[PDB]
């Protein structure tokens, strides 16, 4: 309840620490590996989130390294960071001061689901489009998030702005460097991870995004289950068993299936589900990792055409959030897509 | 409600 003054380092640019005062600190929740507090900046009265993570005495903090590089309207901004000490000894905390966003896609989806109500497809379009932009941006640095789930999609439901958060699982993936998946990609686990791949790529995030889309269309997870084994049974119910070629594309080291055919995608979702949403989902939830759309290709899909209509508005009458403020970095995987992604009225 | 949530409270509870 008292005023706390720290010397905090701005997230972006070289280190230029500033005195920052905040107050009204209270626990509001958690990320995967840190408690999240709300606080009010004394200067502007603005609410911020402070994620407190343990600082290793000998190793750099990877989440901080990644977040200092990022600046995108669909990724939670690292305003500042600072260190604090408990009474223990070697007990040091890294404090990440983040923009505060009050709700998540999961909360809105769960509200609609528990009410037996379909989430309006305009919101599905807006949320998924903004997720795909955030992925296009991080993937352009080689950074894979590895924990894409609806609880990590922050949302202001009135403006419909979505921000990806929680980079505690994220890593730069480099061709030829093996990677593991013990504490990450547990929520919507891509099948190559279930099959034990250590050479996986950022397309694991696109699989997760496909699971988010399917959940928003169905009102429940498409592949529920705690373990990868459990999720795989559920994956087979829809996709059938992977072919020998798909297994080789997922994990060429997987030595040790009956042929079970896929279930038609139109029969997975309720009648009246928009056909383009089903088409999009079928190009995300693919066994072969290289067959999945890239994030930028997904943004350009016909499912998002309504967002490119000149007269589109939110249901509350407000303008849509920013959709066309692309950068070179974000477009870098396929700059010619800019012609389609940004209609003439938007540039 | 029930499940795994980011925040303790929600207007959508
Ligand atoms: Cl949540």
CATH code of the domain covering residue A44: 3.30.200.20
Say yes or no for a CB contact (<8 Å) between A29 and B1: no
Measured in angstroms, how far is the CA atom of residue A100 from the centroid of ligand 1?
A: 14
Asked if residue A2 is part of any domain, the answer here is no
Domain boundary among A76, A99, A122: A99
* Residue A292, both tokens: 């999945």
Resolution rounded to one decimal, in angstroms: 1.4
CA–centroid distance, A105 to ligand 1, in Å, is 7
Whether A193 and A142 have beta carbons less than 8 Å apart is answered as no
| Whole-number Å distance between alpha carbons of A73 and A134 | 8
Token code pair at residue A311:
């007269």
Identify the CATH number of the domain in which residue A229 sits: 1.10.510.10
Calpha distance A190→A12 (Å, rounded): 32
End position of a domain, from candidates A44, A68, A99: A99
The reply to whether A4 falls in a domain is: no
- The CA angle A155-A157-A160, to the nearest 5 degrees, is 75
In B, minimum Cα distance to A112 occurs at: B12
The single-letter DSSP state of residue A173 is: -
Residue among A152, A132, A308 at smallest CA distance from A210: A132
| Statement to judge: residues A259 and A138 lie in one domain | yes
Nearest partner of A63 among A184, A185, A145, A149, judged by Cα: A145
B7 with A28: Cβ contact below 8 A:
yes
Please state the φ and ψ torsions of residue B2, each to the nearest 5 degrees.
Answer: -120, 155
A205 lies in the same domain as A277: yes
Which residues span the domain enclosing A33?
A: 28-99
Residue located via tokens 């967002």: A307
Interface of B with A in 1-13 (CB under 8 A): 1, 3-13
C-alpha–C-alpha distance, residues A168 and A54, integer Å: 12
In a shared domain, residues A182 and A45: no
Chain A residue with CA closest to B4: the answer is A151
Percentages helix, strand, coil for chain A, rounded to the nearest 5? 35, 20, 45
Side by side, the strands of the sheet bearing A161-164 are: A103-104, A153-156, A161-164
Please identify, among A66, A83, A99, the residue that sits at the C-terminal boundary of a domain. A99
Residue A57 falls inside a structural domain: yes
Using a CB–CB cutoff of 8 Å, tell me whether A106 touches chain B: yes
Q: Write A323-330 long-range contacts (CB < 8 A, 24+).
A: A323/A129, A323/A130, A325/A73, A326/A133, A327/A72, A327/A137, A329/A137, A329/A140, A329/A141, A330/A72, A330/A133, A330/A136, A330/A137, A330/A140, A330/A296
Question: Are A158 and A223 found together in one domain?
Answer: yes
Q: How many folded domains does chain A comprise?
A: 2
Same domain? For A79 and A128 the reply is no
- Test A28 with B9 for CB contact under 8 angstroms: yes
Distance CA A292, CA A267 (A): 21
| Residues A78 and A188 occupy one common structural domain | no
A88 shares its domain with A220: no
Q: Residue B11: list chain A partners with CB under 8 A.
A: 102-103, 107
Joined together, the tokens standing for residue A173 give 């993936």
**Is residue A3 in some structural domain?**
no
Q: Are A56 and A111 found together in one domain?
A: no
Position A6 in a domain:
no
- Alpha-carbon A10 to chain mean position: 23
Q: Is residue A198 part of a domain?
A: yes
Domain annotation covers residue A266:
yes
| Residue A55 and residue A108 in one domain | no
Considering the domain architecture, whether residues A60 and A190 belong to the same structural domain is answered as no
Whether residues A279 and A153 share a domain: the answer is: yes
Catalytic residue numbers of A?
147
Query: Angle of helix A203-218 relative to helix A275-282, nearest 10 degrees?
Result: 150
A127 and A222 in a single domain? The answer is yes
Among B4, B8, B12, B13, the residue to mutate for chain A (most A Cβ within 10 A): B12
Using a CB–CB cutoff of 8 Å, tell me whether A30 touches chain B: yes
As a whole number of angstroms, the distance between CA A286 and CA A230 comes to 18
Apex CA A236: angle with CA A290 and CA A169, to 5°?
A: 55
Let me know if residue A19 belongs to a domain. Answer: no
Size of chain A, expressed as the number of residues it contains = 347
Report whether A76 contacts A163 (CB < 8 A).
yes
**Which ranges constitute the DSSP H helices of A56-98?**
62-67
Between CA A189 and CA A234 the distance in angstroms is 12
Chain-centroid distance, C-alpha A38: 21
Nearest CA among A107, A102, A197 for reference residue A144: A197
């Amino acid at each position: 309840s008292k005023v706390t003054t720290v010397v905090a380092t701005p997230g972006q640019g070289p280190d230029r620490p500033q005195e920052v005062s905040y107050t009204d600190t209270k626990v509001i929740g958690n990320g995967s590996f840190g408690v999240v507090y709300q606080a009010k900046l004394c200067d502007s009265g603005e609410l911020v989130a402070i994620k407190k993570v343990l600082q290793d005495k000998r190793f750099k903090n990877r989440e901080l390294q990644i977040m200092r590089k990022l600046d995108h309207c669909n990724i939670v901004r690292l305003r500042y960071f600072f260190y604090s000490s408990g009474e223990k000894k070697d007990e040091v905390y890294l404090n990440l001061v983040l923009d505060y966003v009050p709700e998540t896609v999961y909360r809105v989806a769960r509200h609609y689901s528990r009410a037996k109500q379909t989430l309006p497809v305009i919101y599905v379009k807006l949320y998924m489009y903004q997720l795909f932009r955030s992925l296009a941006y991080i993937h352009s640095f080689g950074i894979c998030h590895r924990d894409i789930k609806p609880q990590n999609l922050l949302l202001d439901p009135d403006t419909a702005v979505l921000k990806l958060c929680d980079f505690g699982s994220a890593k730069q993936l480099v061709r030829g460097e093996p990677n593991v998946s013990y504490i990450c990609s547990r929520y919507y686990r891509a099948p190559e991870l279930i099959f034990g791949a250590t050479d996986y790529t950022s397309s694991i995030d696109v699989w997760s995004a496909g699971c988010v889309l399917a959940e928003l269309l169905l009102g429940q997870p498409i592949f529920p289950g705690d373990s990868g084994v459990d999720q795989l049974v559920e994956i087979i119910k829809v996709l059938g068993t992977p072919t020998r070629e798909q297994i080789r594309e997922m994990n060429p080291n997987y030595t040790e299936f009956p042929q079970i055919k896929a279930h038609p995608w139109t029969k997975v979702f309720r009648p009246r589900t928009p056909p383009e949403a089903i088409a999009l989902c079928s190009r995300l939830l693919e066994y072969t990792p290289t067959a999945r759309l890239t994030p930028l290709e997904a943004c350009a899909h016909s499912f998002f055409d309504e967002l490119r209509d000149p007269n589109v508005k939110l249901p509350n009458g407000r303008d849509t959030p920013a959709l066309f403020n692309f950068t070179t970095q974000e477009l870098s995987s396929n700059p010619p897509l800019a012609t389609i992604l940004i209609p003439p009225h938007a540039r | 409600x029930r499940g795994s949530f980011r925040f303790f409270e929600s207007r959508f509870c």
